[PDB]
């Protein structure tokens, strides 16, 4: 019975590490890719925007998407809520990468302690990704966002624009991070047995 116990714990730990790396990839993709919100059929102008970067059309029945924004230069970010959300989504990425680094501690440190260290680093990463997802909709009143989406847009109101893949992928990342955190806690308590 005990050899099966150890085999299942080892395999589930390996899969937990694999899914942790997958969630880290998801976090990097959502932080980088600017597809959190996008135009619709009834929108005045076309374009899309992410946490800091935003691309808008000039409005001549073509693409000509002038693109502006960068996290290195906080001046170009449209609003303070966008800056706060971009910070939290980064703190979340730096905390998930810290767990992937802390995988190296499995050689020397006790396995239960490392499992719990990543459990707590994944819980915090999910909390940051959740604060970043709640705060990002507050900057939808920014004149730059209002210019693209239209007058109907406002705080906590899509208006005419629609959520694109990055937003729902970030929500999925929140759920994945929370589940992985509980998985790490259970594994850490399970090695002790």
């Amino acid at each position: 019975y005990h050899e099966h116990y150890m085999r299942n714990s080892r395999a589930i730990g390996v899969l937990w590490a694999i899914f942790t790396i997958c969630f880290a990839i998801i976090n990097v993709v959502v932080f980088i890719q600017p597809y959190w919100v996008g135009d619709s059929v009834s929108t005045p102008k076309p374009g899309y925007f992410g946490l800091f970067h935003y691309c808008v059309g000039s409005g001549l029945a073509g693409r000509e998407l002038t693109c502006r924004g960068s996290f290195t230069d906080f001046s170009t970010i449209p609003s303070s809520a966008f800056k706060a959300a971009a910070f939290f989504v980064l703190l979340s990425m730096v905390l998930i990468l810290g767990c992937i680094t802390c995988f190296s501690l499995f050689f020397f440190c006790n396995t239960a302690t490392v499992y719990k260290i990543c459990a707590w680093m994944q819980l915090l990463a999910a909390l940051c990704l959740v604060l970043g997802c709640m705060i990002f909709p507050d900057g939808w009143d920014a004149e730059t966002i209002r210019d693209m989406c239209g007058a109907k847009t406002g705080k906590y109101s899509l208006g005419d624009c629609s959520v694109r893949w990055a937003y729902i992928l970030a929500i999925i990342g929140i759920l994945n991070a929370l589940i992985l955190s509980f998985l790490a806690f259970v594994l850490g308590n399970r090695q002790t047995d």
Binding site: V41, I168, I172, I179, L183
Partner: protein, 33 residues
């Protein structure tokens, strides 16, 4: 460009559901004594 995002959201939700389902399978493996 047809400014409609349904296939994109659909595939994103499908991939997300797949990953989440695998994680619930991880809980299934653990909590099953």
């Amino acid at each position: 460009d047809s400014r409609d995002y349904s296939t994109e959201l659909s595939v994103t939700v499908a991939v997300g559901a797949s990953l989440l389902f695998l994680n619930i399978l991880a809980f299934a493996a653990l909590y099953y004594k």
